[PDB]
């Protein structure tokens, strides 16, 4: 299962962003198909609840090559916001987890993709979005 993770991390700018990837420690396009070779770390697509997306091919077969082969992509449209980190350490978004311009959908990598949200307050959310009851946490101001 863990093989479905794009680890094309090349810290060329020497910024050391990978440090916060492994442990915990400041001043709008829709989600489609994204290649895994330009992704470093897990991909989190944000429905009402945060869902982790794995590495597959063009058809959806789960590939276990760590995103090394060019046939590895992420089908963000099949989970219909999504965020991910690129090879050089940039939070590439599409639609991300900002349901409210003041809040943010919490997930195990909220502080790594959005470091300026550490001082945010968590809240318990319950709502029937499309008939399905989703339970998740937010991060407002």
């Amino acid at each position: 299962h863990i093989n479905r993770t794009a680890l094309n991390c090349n810290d060329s700018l020497q910024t050391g962003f990978i440090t916060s990837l492994f442990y915990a420690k400041c001043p709008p396009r829709p989600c489609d198909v994204v290649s895994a070779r330009t992704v470093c770390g897990p991909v989190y697509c944000f429905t009402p609840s945060p869902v982790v997306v794995g590495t597959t091919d063009k058809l959806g077969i789960p590939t276990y090559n760590w995103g090394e082969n060019e046939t590895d992509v992420f089908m963000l449209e099949s989970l219909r916001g999504c965020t991910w980190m690129n090879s050089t350490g940039f939070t590439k978004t599409c639609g991300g987890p900002w349901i409210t311009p003041r809040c943010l959908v919490d997930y195990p990598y909220r502080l790594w993709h959005y470091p300026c949200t550490v001082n945010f307050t968590l809240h318990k959310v319950r709502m029937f979005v499309g008939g399905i009851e989703h339970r998740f946490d937010a991060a407002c101001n």
Epitope: I2, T5, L7, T19, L21, F22, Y23, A24, P42
Partner: antibody, heavy 120, light 102 residues
Framework: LVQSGAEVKKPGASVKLSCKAS????????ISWVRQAPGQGLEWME????????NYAQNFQGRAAITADTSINTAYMELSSLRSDDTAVYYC?????????????????WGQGVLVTVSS | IQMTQSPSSLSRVSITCRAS??????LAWYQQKPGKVPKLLIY???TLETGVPSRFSGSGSGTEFTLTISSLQPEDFATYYC?????????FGQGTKVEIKR
């Protein structure tokens, strides 16, 4: 996961300690080293995945240098400028990561343990 | 960051592990027998490691944590160390020696 052999060296020298990895991914899990003096507690001398992340302890940050070099998943360990109190058994343990591990980093599996004696 | 265990020597019984700074439940416990390798028991103060007997329980949060054991089997008399795995540097404590009584 197997360490190197027991070594005995005189003070003011350097010791190279090796390790290995089998049955898990080397990039994800970090590889740590633990010191235990004879008849005393466990010392936290630290970790390095092949992603290039290293964070030593305050006391050992000067002379301890842990390099990954994932050629055959070695995770070497070189400790220069030895002293009499450095006589202790050294371990090569797997510390977890916030990627696959449930928390920041836990020593779920440990090494056989290599004895290093420093005396003139 | 500093750690300290309350029971120096031990002879149902529990072991204490107090920190100097506050930690929101990120402590691990370990068992080491004299001559063998340390073994993980609990890795987040509450959840025990898979394969550890259910008689090994853990409670506590914040500055003080506890390792609660009820049944004392012959395979349990050893030294027990607690580890802090919240922030760097990771730090252990002076292990408590659980000795037999006769």
């Amino acid at each position: 996961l197997v360490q190197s052999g027991a070594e005995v060296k005189k003070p003011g020298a350097s010791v190279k300690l090796s390790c290995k990895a089998s049955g898990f991914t080397f990039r994800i899990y970090a590889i740590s080293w633990v010191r235990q003096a004879p008849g005393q507690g466990l010392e936290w001398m630290e970790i390095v995945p092949l992603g290039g992340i290293t964070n030593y302890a305050q006391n050992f940050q000067g002379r301890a240098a842990i390099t990954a070099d994932t050629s055959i998943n070695t995770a070497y360990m070189e400790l220069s400028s030895l002293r009499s109190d450095d006589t202790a058994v050294y371990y090569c343990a797997r510390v977890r990561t916030a990627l696959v591990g449930p928390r920041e980093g836990i020593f779920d599996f440990w090494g056989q343990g290599v004895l290093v004696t420093v005396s003139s | 960051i500093q750690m300290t265990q309350s029971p120096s020597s031990l002879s149902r019984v529990s072991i204490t592990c107090r920190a100097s700074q506050t930690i929101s439940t990120y402590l691990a416990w370990y068992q080491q027998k004299p001559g063998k390798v340390p073994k993980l028991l609990i890795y987040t103060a509450s959840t025990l490691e898979t394969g550890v007997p259910s008689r090994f329980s853990g409670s506590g949060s914040g500055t003080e944590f506890t390792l609660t054991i009820s049944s004392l089997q012959p395979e349990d008399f050893a030294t027990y160390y607690c580890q802090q795995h919240d922030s760097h540097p990771y730090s252990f404590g002076q292990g408590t020696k659980v000795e037999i009584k006769r």
